[PDB]
UniProtKB/Swiss-Prot annotation, chains A, B, C, D, E:
Paired cysteines (S-S): none
GO molecular function annotation: ATP binding; ATP hydrolysis activity; DNA binding; RNA binding
Lineage of the species this protein comes from: Viruses, Duplodnaviria, Heunggongvirae, Uroviricota, Caudoviricetes
Principal EC category: hydrolase
Record carries keyword Transport: no
Known outcome of mutating residue 143 to A/K: Complete loss of DNA packaging
Domain notes: The N-terminus contains the ATPase activity and the C-terminus (CTD) binds DNA. The CTD is likely a vestigial nuclease that has lost its hydrolytic capability since Phi-29 is not a concatamer that neads cleavage.
Organism in which the protein naturally occurs: Bacillus phage phi29 (Bacteriophage phi-29)
Xref: Pfam families: Podovirus_Gp16
Protein name: DNA packaging protein
Residue numbers spanned by region DNA-binding: 230-327
Mutagenesis / variant outcome for changing residue 325 to N: Complete loss of packaging
């Protein structure tokens, strides 16, 4: 039948599953045809979350088109109310319109799906405190923790969303499913998706020119800050510096005379330095602004040239801000 | 002659036309007539995007100035929706919520019936990457390669907006048309320019001399952004200043000594200078505040003098911004 | 009389009505009444024009104070709607919001209405492209050759303002009215101001004592920067600069050896000091805060001493602003 | 008694009523009882005045605490307007939105009330020439002569004020009312000082410590800043300064070098110096780059020593800010 | 004891209340439970005082536990307010804006809530005269002190802060209950986080992640501000200084080359240093920052290395700041 069925991501037993990164043409129908069926089978109530209030008028549609699947049950949709057997089965909620839903009747639900969670192509429009609210949302509208499902379908090709900014996820393009103790990021039908888009440019060559626009192909490309060098030695080393309560050693090597800055503490503890007296101690000395720079003339020249290398991007940023303060 | 004349625009028949000029001077007249002409031919309904929502509460009189074009049949508005003899005419919405629209069926489109797509000196209105927003709009008004023909229409001619140089849309003041695969750059006849500007000279003499200023001249002729003297020559590559991710270099031609800022490459592997740490890696060298004025002594002096010359407008803008950064 | 009516001013029929200062002369309510009379007797629509959107309370602040003076006619206030004798002809017009203007069809308004024209010590966030904005509005409404008038009044006598400077008008207290090829200027009388000053002094001693204060003088006579010395002379020419639009040319007189500043410029290949590259070209020269001071120490020491006299008021203004920039 | 009593305050009944002292002792409530007594029995309309937008929005609550005073009448705030007995009784107008509001309706005005006309522990957050905006208000309200009042209320005696310094008044700390033909300066009674202070002490003992805190005394008896040394002597002077439109003389003592800054400005061709660029005369000299340090060495050292002595509070402060601007 | 009991704090029932050094798990839990229950049983209004504007969105997320203690009370978040059972409970405002909202009088406030009056291990930028502004608020809202309290919670144990120095407090952190006439200082037992956090985590892991908010971890950790030894020496002093109204006298012990910073300083003819004009008087001597080193080279050197000593861990604050004034 259909290539993709959410049965795998449901049976994974993971509390949090994220079907994010595809069109949703088959996906949304796939996991919208099941919940009404679970209601009819085991009285299992269901909630869909639209991104915001005006989307309530866009959710009444599907009950009509699912007619072929649901012949023998009376189908009614009344704003938020979902009526099957002339009875309440599901509820659709906006994120900002939440107050009236706090006292609303949600006896037992194990599904909350976010669709179009990001306002697509607004000026990064933010819904106030999405996840700071969502924590109490999950613990409140749902009954318990045993068998609770918090899912997010996506249509936008999002390298990250503010929800991810909170949870701080680290997925990969390779792993179709990204499973953890709690969470699971799923990238749907990646090849077919791409193929499913290919064919539409055959239906319209001007859409071929539109695809040729680097904007369409650059949302498949992520951008961020990147590391510089990941280096270490196996030989002698001399200096030591500390800043903002964090210590950075200095490594040297005679072979090519190279110079690295890697984590190294010397209980011998000579010439330990800071830029600012917020890290004062009887051992360290408040460095003169630039004379100590000339003392570390080799370090200065290594910064000017390529002779300075490091083993982290975090060490990169700390060292770089120190360099900016150095002059 | 007399008015705005879309005959050549319709004639050369790009699937996507691109015209500019005539601020309020019928740049919207003929193009609001044309959808009703398609309706008298009994074609398809049109789509009207708006920049924002308040702009909608007053604009229900969209057919007032086309009655004197076509007094014959019924051209009215029931409210938000436009009706010609009672049949649906225009799908009329601002930008904010097109995503909620994009799952609806849109089988009938005729033409693009919006103007002031981009306003001069107006980016607070703008939405980030709205060029791809128009891409989503077009693909959600596409069913095949037919039924659609598009126009852009800015009040004046500029060469700095992302769309142009993204498509290398280059205006020509000697010739009316500039032709590409699908993109045209045009303006009404220079003879029609003479006729209509002379018509404005007639009557309100103050409204004529206000056109005598370049203030009202540039709105319709579009002579803008060509500010610095600019040339090019065959000198040798000497220096290159990697700034914010650019391979900018300097040609120095001693015969008739001037510095030309054209872009090129040689395997110099030296003399490449960076003014930021983000553009620095382990094969180029960093330069602090003053040392640019000394190592690029030729650059500094030729900038202070009139001896510095330029090649391209984008290079001119980024170089002046750099000249602001260098202190 | 009590409240002068501007028909004698309107007699000349130039579109621009530059009335300045006149705190409390009743130009406000005269320009309220006049379009009402025009609509009543002929049928011409009217629009109350301000600069910004946020003011909505001016539904009642404009129309109540002038509602009663009409003896035997009907008026209706419907928010942004104004009705005279059951005829809808009046609405509020914001300038900061230009976009709604470019959608709205123009009501046939004989004269645009505007007082509080000048900004006195505002936050300086006025409308950019201000004179261009007024030109765009004038072109937008009545694109035909039918003539349209405008009335604009300033709270206090600011001798130079962006539009006044822009169209190179010049003020003259001695002659109340002023006429050019396409311009009309006007100044308030002194008899009415004297009468009102006696009214305040005899009425209450608070404003009787406040009359001797500077601010009340400014409310009638409009104290400006004219007080500083302002003369020119026919001495020999010495030096020349260009500053963001004005080509200052400075003369020197050995007799008493002072220095004079005039807008007259000597066409000469001598070095011209440009403070900003926005005036850079082949022959001008860019200079920074040190060497301009070192080579124009003549000018600077002459300025701190009593050794400068300016030809024109705008010359004084631009010279002082430039000196502030240099400081 | 404990309540704030305005009987002797109205005993003179002048329009400029600077009411000082008794921080937060219900003087503002005693005000609030007044415009009710005026409007209800007479129909006159009142004006509420405060600097900034938060105090514009929540003025209803400041009227809500009035909903207990007059039971029979109806007191409702619609929008940001006060309705007493179902009729419009007053308006609350902020200052910063001032110019546009100059054209507000004043069919009749009773009292323009402004708490905290002195700034409270802030950083120069005075609307520049706030006095100009206030006096423009009184000018605009002055169309209906009879019974106009402009009440301004504060909480501490302070010659550190644009107001008192601007009107060149000499306040007193013991004369219960410093009166002129137009204005009043009120220091509250003595018995109620003790009454409220014992009230604070009895209610709580850290309130007694506040009674030991000099801040409470300043908010009760006022800071005249008389503490800084002050004297004068017949001895002559060397230099002469003008700052912020005020002359200034530097008396020099024959013996002991006790420098005086008394206002002894003899009209002389002697050298006179300023620092603010607004001060320029044909007779006097400007000073820059710390030349004044090399001219008045003895004054600089004398202030850096205990030698200097200031004749007047206005003189003393003005010298302070001049020193602040010097560096 | 597993649960902190705010009964312990209100058993001593002092008006001035400082709950400091809490871990903010059980202390925050109980403190959150306290006030709404107190109002519900009796009735009270509360103010949620905070630092700045960016934290205005944090207040809307506060009832994650209290509603759990109220299975039958519905607390609805209305923007920046809370409604208990549909009734406006109190209000939440950033502290600094209160100065603008200074003069507003509120009916009868019982508990004045504040959190983290001391902000530890950060920038900790504090507006000048914060304590004076807080006392201004206290004076503003109070006439009758019948059972009114000002409660503040901070998660730090430290005697160096604006408030303790302001009130001349000397609480010893080793103990757990120091008292003043109307103030109380306590340190809650650290073992209070357990039964609040790892019980609800030991239940289920997804519950432990439900705890979260990612901010409890900052408060739980504790740090000691002591850097070097604090001692007093029996060798006599040489120089003395006065800073921001806080005196100081530097002592020297030639043996072992030490210097001490005991505040106890002997007045004599030797006039002290000063750094700002306000602090200056008719007897003391003031110096510029550069000549400060040329007076106390030994102070300079003791700031370079670790020669200088201290007498109290709070003194190190004044020393650090005055060092920064040296620049
Ligand atoms: N075929 C035409 N017949 C008559 N007038 C025309 C014709 N074409 C253009 N015009 C002129 O165009 C004016 C109205 O054109 P508009 O629709 O305003 O064009 P526009 O440039 O879009 O200006 P805006 O900003 O859209 S209102 C009329 O008042 C005429 O002066
Ligand atoms: N038709 C009228 N009926 C009655 N009073 C009028 C009329 N026209 C003007 N006035 C008077 O004009 C006086 C001045 O009010 P405004 O009309 O606001 O003056 P204004 O000239 O706009 O002041 P400026 O120049 O804008 S600062 C008022 O006191 C009115 O009584
Ligand atoms: N008749 C009254 N008797 C006693 N206290 C009163 C009375 N009327 C008001 N108050 C109280 O006075 C206090 C301060 O209110 P305000 O009227 O604003 O004081 P104020 O004198 O105006 O000083 P500010 O700076 O305006 S708050 C409040 O606590 C009121 O409850
Ligand atoms: Mg148009
Ligand atoms: Mg006016
Ligand atoms: Mg008050």
């Amino acid at each position: 039948s259909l290539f993709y069925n959410p049965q795998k991501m449901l049976s994974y037993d993971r509390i949090l599953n994220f079907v994010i990164g595809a069109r949703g043409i088959g996906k949304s129908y796939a996991m919208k045809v099941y919940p009404i069926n679970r209601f009819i089978k085991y009285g299992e109530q269901f909630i869909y979350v639209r991104r915001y209030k005006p989307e309530l008028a866009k959710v009444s549609n599907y009950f009509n088109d699912v007619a072929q699947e649901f012949p023998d049950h009376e189908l009614v949709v009344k704003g938020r109310r979902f009526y099957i057997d002339g009875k309440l089965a599901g509820w659709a909620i906006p994120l900002s319109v939440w107050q009236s839903e706090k006292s609303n009747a949600y006896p037992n639900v194990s599904t909350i799906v976010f669709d179009e969670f990001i306002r697509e192509k607004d000026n990064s429009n933010y819904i106030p405190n999405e996840v700071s609210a969502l924590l109490n949302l999950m613990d409140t509208v749902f009954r318990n923790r045993e068998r609770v499902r918090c899912i997010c379908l996506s249509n936008a090709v999002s390298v990250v969303n503010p929800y991810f900014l909170f949870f701080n996820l680290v997925p990969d393009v390779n792993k179709r499913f990204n499973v953890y103790d709690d969470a699971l990021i799923e990238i749907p039908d990646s090849l077919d998706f791409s193929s499913e888009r290919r064919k539409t440019r055959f239906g319209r060559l001007i859409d071929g020119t539109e695809y040729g626009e680097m904007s369409l192909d650059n949302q498949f490309i992520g951008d961020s800050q990147v590391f510089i060098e990941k280096r270490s030695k196996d030989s002698k080393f001399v200096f030591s510096i500390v800043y903002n309560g964090f210590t950075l050693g200095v490594w040297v090597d005679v072979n090519q005379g190279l110079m690295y800055i890697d984590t190294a503490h010397d209980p011998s503890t000579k010439n330990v330095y800071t830029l600012t007296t917020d890290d004062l101690n009887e051992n360290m000395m408040l460095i003169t602004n630039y004379k100590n720079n000339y003392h570390l003339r080799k370090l200065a020249s290594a910064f000017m040239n390529g002779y300075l290398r490091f083993d982290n991007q975090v060490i990169r940023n700390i060292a770089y801000e120190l360099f900016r303060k150095m002059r």
